[PDB]
Amino acid sequence: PKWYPSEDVAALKKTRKAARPQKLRASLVPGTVLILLAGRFRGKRVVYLKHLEDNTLLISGPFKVNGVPLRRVNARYVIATS
RNA sequence: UUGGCGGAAAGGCCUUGGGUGCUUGCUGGCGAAUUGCAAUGCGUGGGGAUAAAUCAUUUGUAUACGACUUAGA
């Protein structure tokens, strides 16, 4: 914060990479039934509830039906049913 | 547990009878969580008894040396 650099490491250039919201595939819609391909609950059927700002999908089993609680999941490890 | 069957490398096929579990065929309840967003998720090396082999002896229907051929608790 206030310590002067004791070794003049070169500063990084102005990176021209602005963050953009994830463009999820149209097949992913809220309320869709999802199949988990990996992780603790791999192979379980899950319901798509909400999209999170961290590029993850807020999902629920529901917990009562199959024991899968509210957890974050990646869209790339999920198959969206009709 | 009963009966038959499979010889090509059968060694497998059913099957009468009962025993004990599941049944998602149908109706419901209990728990999943925090692993936190994926890192696939089987015989020795030393002893106790002993079935058998080789050597010793002998044998000669065998013989350059191995090998082969007999018999004595």
mmCIF file of all heavy atoms in Angstrom, chain B residues 29-41:
data_model
loop_
_atom_site.group_PDB
_atom_site.id
_atom_site.type_symbol
_atom_site.label_atom_id
_atom_site.label_comp_id
_atom_site.label_asym_id
_atom_site.label_seq_id
_atom_site.Cartn_x
_atom_site.Cartn_y
_atom_site.Cartn_z
ATOM 1 P P G B 29 -45.043 -38.920 0.872
ATOM 2 O OP1 G B 29 -45.335 -37.464 0.914
ATOM 3 O OP2 G B 29 -44.187 -39.464 -0.214
ATOM 4 O "O5'" G B 29 -44.391 -39.330 2.268
ATOM 5 C "C5'" G B 29 -44.962 -38.892 3.491
ATOM 6 C "C4'" G B 29 -44.355 -39.597 4.680
ATOM 7 O "O4'" G B 29 -44.493 -41.034 4.527
ATOM 8 C "C3'" G B 29 -42.863 -39.395 4.895
ATOM 9 O "O3'" G B 29 -42.553 -38.164 5.523
ATOM 10 C "C2'" G B 29 -42.483 -40.614 5.726
ATOM 11 O "O2'" G B 29 -42.827 -40.434 7.092
ATOM 12 C "C1'" G B 29 -43.393 -41.688 5.127
ATOM 13 N N9 G B 29 -42.702 -42.502 4.108
ATOM 14 C C8 G B 29 -42.905 -42.503 2.750
ATOM 15 N N7 G B 29 -42.134 -43.344 2.115
ATOM 16 C C5 G B 29 -41.376 -43.937 3.115
ATOM 17 C C6 G B 29 -40.366 -44.933 3.041
ATOM 18 O O6 G B 29 -39.922 -45.510 2.043
ATOM 19 N N1 G B 29 -39.859 -45.245 4.299
ATOM 20 C C2 G B 29 -40.271 -44.674 5.479
ATOM 21 N N2 G B 29 -39.657 -45.106 6.589
ATOM 22 N N3 G B 29 -41.209 -43.747 5.562
ATOM 23 C C4 G B 29 -41.716 -43.429 4.351
ATOM 24 P P C B 30 -41.157 -37.426 5.215
ATOM 25 O OP1 C B 30 -41.194 -36.091 5.863
ATOM 26 O OP2 C B 30 -40.896 -37.526 3.756
ATOM 27 O "O5'" C B 30 -40.072 -38.311 5.973
ATOM 28 C "C5'" C B 30 -40.022 -38.349 7.392
ATOM 29 C "C4'" C B 30 -39.071 -39.410 7.890
ATOM 30 O "O4'" C B 30 -39.415 -40.693 7.304
ATOM 31 C "C3'" C B 30 -37.605 -39.219 7.530
ATOM 32 O "O3'" C B 30 -36.940 -38.314 8.395
ATOM 33 C "C2'" C B 30 -37.056 -40.639 7.599
ATOM 34 O "O2'" C B 30 -36.775 -41.018 8.939
ATOM 35 C "C1'" C B 30 -38.246 -41.455 7.092
ATOM 36 N N1 C B 30 -38.137 -41.776 5.650
ATOM 37 C C2 C B 30 -37.262 -42.790 5.251
ATOM 38 O O2 C B 30 -36.598 -43.385 6.111
ATOM 39 N N3 C B 30 -37.149 -43.097 3.938
ATOM 40 C C4 C B 30 -37.881 -42.433 3.041
ATOM 41 N N4 C B 30 -37.746 -42.764 1.754
ATOM 42 C C5 C B 30 -38.784 -41.397 3.418
ATOM 43 C C6 C B 30 -38.881 -41.104 4.721
ATOM 44 P P G B 31 -36.127 -37.064 7.795
ATOM 45 O OP1 G B 31 -35.741 -36.183 8.927
ATOM 46 O OP2 G B 31 -36.912 -36.504 6.665
ATOM 47 O "O5'" G B 31 -34.799 -37.713 7.199
ATOM 48 C "C5'" G B 31 -33.663 -37.948 8.019
ATOM 49 C "C4'" G B 31 -32.456 -38.306 7.187
ATOM 50 O "O4'" G B 31 -32.662 -39.602 6.569
ATOM 51 C "C3'" G B 31 -32.163 -37.371 6.022
ATOM 52 O "O3'" G B 31 -31.414 -36.235 6.411
ATOM 53 C "C2'" G B 31 -31.437 -38.274 5.033
ATOM 54 O "O2'" G B 31 -30.071 -38.430 5.386
ATOM 55 C "C1'" G B 31 -32.148 -39.603 5.254
ATOM 56 N N9 G B 31 -33.279 -39.819 4.334
ATOM 57 C C8 G B 31 -34.495 -39.181 4.343
ATOM 58 N N7 G B 31 -35.307 -39.616 3.419
ATOM 59 C C5 G B 31 -34.583 -40.606 2.768
ATOM 60 C C6 G B 31 -34.937 -41.437 1.676
ATOM 61 O O6 G B 31 -35.998 -41.470 1.039
ATOM 62 N N1 G B 31 -33.900 -42.296 1.336
ATOM 63 C C2 G B 31 -32.681 -42.362 1.965
ATOM 64 N N2 G B 31 -31.814 -43.266 1.487
ATOM 65 N N3 G B 31 -32.338 -41.593 2.983
ATOM 66 C C4 G B 31 -33.331 -40.745 3.324
ATOM 67 P P A B 32 -31.241 -35.000 5.400
ATOM 68 O OP1 A B 32 -30.696 -33.852 6.166
ATOM 69 O OP2 A B 32 -32.519 -34.854 4.658
ATOM 70 O "O5'" A B 32 -30.123 -35.493 4.377
ATOM 71 C "C5'" A B 32 -28.857 -35.949 4.843
ATOM 72 C "C4'" A B 32 -28.192 -36.871 3.850
ATOM 73 O "O4'" A B 32 -29.195 -37.752 3.271
ATOM 74 C "C3'" A B 32 -27.510 -36.175 2.675
ATOM 75 O "O3'" A B 32 -26.343 -36.901 2.294
ATOM 76 C "C2'" A B 32 -28.561 -36.260 1.573
ATOM 77 O "O2'" A B 32 -28.049 -36.187 0.260
ATOM 78 C "C1'" A B 32 -29.194 -37.618 1.862
ATOM 79 N N9 A B 32 -30.572 -37.751 1.380
ATOM 80 C C8 A B 32 -31.637 -36.919 1.625
ATOM 81 N N7 A B 32 -32.751 -37.301 1.053
ATOM 82 C C5 A B 32 -32.399 -38.464 0.383
ATOM 83 C C6 A B 32 -33.136 -39.355 -0.418
ATOM 84 N N6 A B 32 -34.434 -39.206 -0.691
ATOM 85 N N1 A B 32 -32.485 -40.419 -0.935
ATOM 86 C C2 A B 32 -31.183 -40.569 -0.662
ATOM 87 N N3 A B 32 -30.383 -39.801 0.075
ATOM 88 C C4 A B 32 -31.061 -38.754 0.576
ATOM 89 P P A B 33 -24.889 -36.369 2.720
ATOM 90 O OP1 A B 33 -23.880 -37.054 1.871
ATOM 91 O OP2 A B 33 -24.782 -36.452 4.199
ATOM 92 O "O5'" A B 33 -24.912 -34.830 2.312
ATOM 93 C "C5'" A B 33 -25.045 -34.442 0.950
ATOM 94 C "C4'" A B 33 -25.299 -32.961 0.807
ATOM 95 O "O4'" A B 33 -26.578 -32.632 1.420
ATOM 96 C "C3'" A B 33 -24.263 -32.053 1.470
ATOM 97 O "O3'" A B 33 -24.077 -30.877 0.684
ATOM 98 C "C2'" A B 33 -24.928 -31.690 2.794
ATOM 99 O "O2'" A B 33 -24.477 -30.482 3.368
ATOM 100 C "C1'" A B 33 -26.394 -31.610 2.381
ATOM 101 N N9 A B 33 -27.345 -31.816 3.477
ATOM 102 C C8 A B 33 -27.263 -32.709 4.517
ATOM 103 N N7 A B 33 -28.277 -32.649 5.346
ATOM 104 C C5 A B 33 -29.080 -31.648 4.819
ATOM 105 C C6 A B 33 -30.307 -31.101 5.234
ATOM 106 N N6 A B 33 -30.966 -31.506 6.322
ATOM 107 N N1 A B 33 -30.841 -30.113 4.483
ATOM 108 C C2 A B 33 -30.179 -29.709 3.392
ATOM 109 N N3 A B 33 -29.021 -30.144 2.901
ATOM 110 C C4 A B 33 -28.517 -31.125 3.669
ATOM 111 P P U B 34 -22.666 -30.600 -0.031
ATOM 112 O OP1 U B 34 -22.717 -29.248 -0.642
ATOM 113 O OP2 U B 34 -22.340 -31.776 -0.877
ATOM 114 O "O5'" U B 34 -21.626 -30.558 1.175
ATOM 115 C "C5'" U B 34 -20.227 -30.656 0.934
ATOM 116 C "C4'" U B 34 -19.439 -30.745 2.219
ATOM 117 O "O4'" U B 34 -19.508 -29.464 2.904
ATOM 118 C "C3'" U B 34 -19.956 -31.786 3.216
ATOM 119 O "O3'" U B 34 -18.903 -32.398 3.981
ATOM 120 C "C2'" U B 34 -20.842 -30.954 4.137
ATOM 121 O "O2'" U B 34 -21.040 -31.504 5.422
ATOM 122 C "C1'" U B 34 -20.072 -29.637 4.192
ATOM 123 N N1 U B 34 -20.904 -28.464 4.506
ATOM 124 C C2 U B 34 -21.628 -27.864 3.493
ATOM 125 O O2 U B 34 -21.625 -28.257 2.340
ATOM 126 N N3 U B 34 -22.371 -26.777 3.882
ATOM 127 C C4 U B 34 -22.460 -26.239 5.150
ATOM 128 O O4 U B 34 -23.176 -25.253 5.339
ATOM 129 C C5 U B 34 -21.681 -26.911 6.143
ATOM 130 C C6 U B 34 -20.948 -27.973 5.791
ATOM 131 P P U B 35 -17.368 -31.908 3.923
ATOM 132 O OP1 U B 35 -16.627 -32.689 4.944
ATOM 133 O OP2 U B 35 -17.302 -30.426 3.969
ATOM 134 O "O5'" U B 35 -16.861 -32.395 2.494
ATOM 135 C "C5'" U B 35 -15.662 -31.876 1.928
ATOM 136 C "C4'" U B 35 -15.462 -32.349 0.510
ATOM 137 O "O4'" U B 35 -15.454 -33.804 0.492
ATOM 138 C "C3'" U B 35 -16.544 -31.919 -0.480
ATOM 139 O "O3'" U B 35 -15.962 -31.700 -1.765
ATOM 140 C "C2'" U B 35 -17.464 -33.134 -0.523
ATOM 141 O "O2'" U B 35 -18.232 -33.251 -1.703
ATOM 142 C "C1'" U B 35 -16.463 -34.277 -0.381
ATOM 143 N N1 U B 35 -17.032 -35.506 0.193
ATOM 144 C C2 U B 35 -17.152 -36.616 -0.621
ATOM 145 O O2 U B 35 -16.811 -36.627 -1.792
ATOM 146 N N3 U B 35 -17.691 -37.723 -0.013
ATOM 147 C C4 U B 35 -18.112 -37.831 1.296
ATOM 148 O O4 U B 35 -18.577 -38.900 1.694
ATOM 149 C C5 U B 35 -17.956 -36.642 2.077
ATOM 150 C C6 U B 35 -17.433 -35.550 1.509
ATOM 151 P P G B 36 -16.749 -30.862 -2.890
ATOM 152 O OP1 G B 36 -17.650 -31.799 -3.608
ATOM 153 O OP2 G B 36 -15.750 -30.076 -3.656
ATOM 154 O "O5'" G B 36 -17.652 -29.840 -2.066
ATOM 155 C "C5'" G B 36 -19.012 -29.614 -2.428
ATOM 156 C "C4'" G B 36 -19.421 -28.178 -2.214
ATOM 157 O "O4'" G B 36 -19.399 -27.882 -0.789
ATOM 158 C "C3'" G B 36 -18.518 -27.137 -2.875
ATOM 159 O "O3'" G B 36 -19.297 -26.021 -3.303
ATOM 160 C "C2'" G B 36 -17.596 -26.718 -1.736
ATOM 161 O "O2'" G B 36 -17.022 -25.436 -1.883
ATOM 162 C "C1'" G B 36 -18.542 -26.784 -0.542
ATOM 163 N N9 G B 36 -17.880 -26.994 0.748
ATOM 164 C C8 G B 36 -16.855 -27.865 1.033
ATOM 165 N N7 G B 36 -16.474 -27.823 2.280
ATOM 166 C C5 G B 36 -17.298 -26.866 2.858
ATOM 167 C C6 G B 36 -17.356 -26.386 4.192
ATOM 168 O O6 G B 36 -16.667 -26.721 5.163
ATOM 169 N N1 G B 36 -18.340 -25.414 4.344
ATOM 170 C C2 G B 36 -19.163 -24.962 3.342
ATOM 171 N N2 G B 36 -20.052 -24.018 3.688
ATOM 172 N N3 G B 36 -19.120 -25.401 2.095
ATOM 173 C C4 G B 36 -18.170 -26.346 1.925
ATOM 174 P P C B 37 -18.856 -25.173 -4.595
ATOM 175 O OP1 C B 37 -17.530 -24.566 -4.314
ATOM 176 O OP2 C B 37 -19.994 -24.304 -4.985
ATOM 177 O "O5'" C B 37 -18.663 -26.271 -5.733
ATOM 178 C "C5'" C B 37 -19.730 -27.139 -6.102
ATOM 179 C "C4'" C B 37 -19.669 -27.504 -7.564
ATOM 180 O "O4'" C B 37 -19.741 -26.288 -8.357
ATOM 181 C "C3'" C B 37 -18.392 -28.219 -8.000
ATOM 182 O "O3'" C B 37 -18.688 -29.146 -9.046
ATOM 183 C "C2'" C B 37 -17.537 -27.079 -8.541
ATOM 184 O "O2'" C B 37 -16.549 -27.471 -9.471
ATOM 185 C "C1'" C B 37 -18.593 -26.180 -9.178
ATOM 186 N N1 C B 37 -18.211 -24.761 -9.248
ATOM 187 C C2 C B 37 -17.890 -24.191 -10.485
ATOM 188 O O2 C B 37 -17.928 -24.893 -11.507
ATOM 189 N N3 C B 37 -17.541 -22.884 -10.539
ATOM 190 C C4 C B 37 -17.508 -22.153 -9.424
ATOM 191 N N4 C B 37 -17.160 -20.869 -9.526
ATOM 192 C C5 C B 37 -17.833 -22.707 -8.153
ATOM 193 C C6 C B 37 -18.177 -24.001 -8.112
ATOM 194 P P A B 38 -19.430 -30.533 -8.713
ATOM 195 O OP1 A B 38 -20.808 -30.457 -9.259
ATOM 196 O OP2 A B 38 -19.227 -30.829 -7.272
ATOM 197 O "O5'" A B 38 -18.625 -31.619 -9.557
ATOM 198 C "C5'" A B 38 -17.288 -31.962 -9.225
ATOM 199 C "C4'" A B 38 -16.593 -32.646 -10.376
ATOM 200 O "O4'" A B 38 -16.411 -31.702 -11.461
ATOM 201 C "C3'" A B 38 -15.192 -33.171 -10.094
ATOM 202 O "O3'" A B 38 -15.206 -34.446 -9.472
ATOM 203 C "C2'" A B 38 -14.547 -33.178 -11.475
ATOM 204 O "O2'" A B 38 -14.915 -34.337 -12.209
ATOM 205 C "C1'" A B 38 -15.196 -31.958 -12.129
ATOM 206 N N9 A B 38 -14.355 -30.747 -12.058
ATOM 207 C C8 A B 38 -14.564 -29.630 -11.286
ATOM 208 N N7 A B 38 -13.657 -28.699 -11.448
ATOM 209 C C5 A B 38 -12.796 -29.234 -12.396
ATOM 210 C C6 A B 38 -11.628 -28.738 -12.998
ATOM 211 N N6 A B 38 -11.103 -27.542 -12.721
ATOM 212 N N1 A B 38 -11.007 -29.522 -13.907
ATOM 213 C C2 A B 38 -11.533 -30.721 -14.183
ATOM 214 N N3 A B 38 -12.625 -31.298 -13.683
ATOM 215 C C4 A B 38 -13.217 -30.493 -12.786
ATOM 216 P P A B 39 -14.090 -34.841 -8.384
ATOM 217 O OP1 A B 39 -14.507 -36.116 -7.747
ATOM 218 O OP2 A B 39 -13.827 -33.651 -7.537
ATOM 219 O "O5'" A B 39 -12.784 -35.130 -9.250
ATOM 220 C "C5'" A B 39 -12.807 -36.051 -10.338
ATOM 221 C "C4'" A B 39 -11.515 -36.012 -11.116
ATOM 222 O "O4'" A B 39 -11.116 -34.624 -11.276
ATOM 223 C "C3'" A B 39 -10.339 -36.711 -10.444
ATOM 224 O "O3'" A B 39 -9.452 -37.229 -11.435
ATOM 225 C "C2'" A B 39 -9.666 -35.576 -9.682
ATOM 226 O "O2'" A B 39 -8.300 -35.787 -9.394
ATOM 227 C "C1'" A B 39 -9.873 -34.400 -10.635
ATOM 228 N N9 A B 39 -9.945 -33.103 -9.961
ATOM 229 C C8 A B 39 -10.862 -32.724 -9.013
ATOM 230 N N7 A B 39 -10.698 -31.501 -8.578
ATOM 231 C C5 A B 39 -9.601 -31.045 -9.291
ATOM 232 C C6 A B 39 -8.928 -29.815 -9.283
ATOM 233 N N6 A B 39 -9.293 -28.801 -8.499
ATOM 234 N N1 A B 39 -7.869 -29.666 -10.108
ATOM 235 C C2 A B 39 -7.521 -30.699 -10.887
ATOM 236 N N3 A B 39 -8.076 -31.907 -10.985
ATOM 237 C C4 A B 39 -9.125 -32.016 -10.151
ATOM 238 P P U B 40 -9.186 -38.810 -11.546
ATOM 239 O OP1 U B 40 -9.471 -39.431 -10.227
ATOM 240 O OP2 U B 40 -7.852 -39.001 -12.166
ATOM 241 O "O5'" U B 40 -10.282 -39.313 -12.588
ATOM 242 C "C5'" U B 40 -11.618 -39.568 -12.179
ATOM 243 C "C4'" U B 40 -12.171 -40.801 -12.849
ATOM 244 O "O4'" U B 40 -11.189 -41.869 -12.784
ATOM 245 C "C3'" U B 40 -13.417 -41.403 -12.214
ATOM 246 O "O3'" U B 40 -14.613 -40.753 -12.604
ATOM 247 C "C2'" U B 40 -13.342 -42.860 -12.652
ATOM 248 O "O2'" U B 40 -13.794 -43.020 -13.988
ATOM 249 C "C1'" U B 40 -11.836 -43.112 -12.603
ATOM 250 N N1 U B 40 -11.411 -43.677 -11.303
ATOM 251 C C2 U B 40 -11.563 -45.035 -11.108
ATOM 252 O O2 U B 40 -12.026 -45.778 -11.957
ATOM 253 N N3 U B 40 -11.150 -45.492 -9.882
ATOM 254 C C4 U B 40 -10.613 -44.743 -8.854
ATOM 255 O O4 U B 40 -10.289 -45.302 -7.805
ATOM 256 C C5 U B 40 -10.489 -43.344 -9.130
ATOM 257 C C6 U B 40 -10.884 -42.874 -10.319
ATOM 258 P P G B 41 -15.917 -40.853 -11.670
ATOM 259 O OP1 G B 41 -17.118 -40.766 -12.541
ATOM 260 O OP2 G B 41 -15.754 -39.895 -10.546
ATOM 261 O "O5'" G B 41 -15.843 -42.330 -11.076
ATOM 262 C "C5'" G B 41 -16.496 -42.666 -9.862
ATOM 263 C "C4'" G B 41 -15.585 -43.448 -8.949
ATOM 264 O "O4'" G B 41 -14.365 -42.696 -8.716
ATOM 265 C "C3'" G B 41 -16.121 -43.730 -7.553
ATOM 266 O "O3'" G B 41 -16.997 -44.843 -7.512
ATOM 267 C "C2'" G B 41 -14.848 -43.923 -6.740
ATOM 268 O "O2'" G B 41 -14.315 -45.228 -6.921
ATOM 269 C "C1'" G B 41 -13.911 -42.910 -7.395
ATOM 270 N N9 G B 41 -13.898 -41.615 -6.686
ATOM 271 C C8 G B 41 -14.965 -40.972 -6.106
ATOM 272 N N7 G B 41 -14.642 -39.835 -5.553
ATOM 273 C C5 G B 41 -13.279 -39.718 -5.782
ATOM 274 C C6 G B 41 -12.370 -38.691 -5.416
ATOM 275 O O6 G B 41 -12.598 -37.646 -4.794
ATOM 276 N N1 G B 41 -11.079 -38.973 -5.848
ATOM 277 C C2 G B 41 -10.706 -40.097 -6.544
ATOM 278 N N2 G B 41 -9.409 -40.186 -6.872
ATOM 279 N N3 G B 41 -11.543 -41.062 -6.892
ATOM 280 C C4 G B 41 -12.804 -40.807 -6.483
#
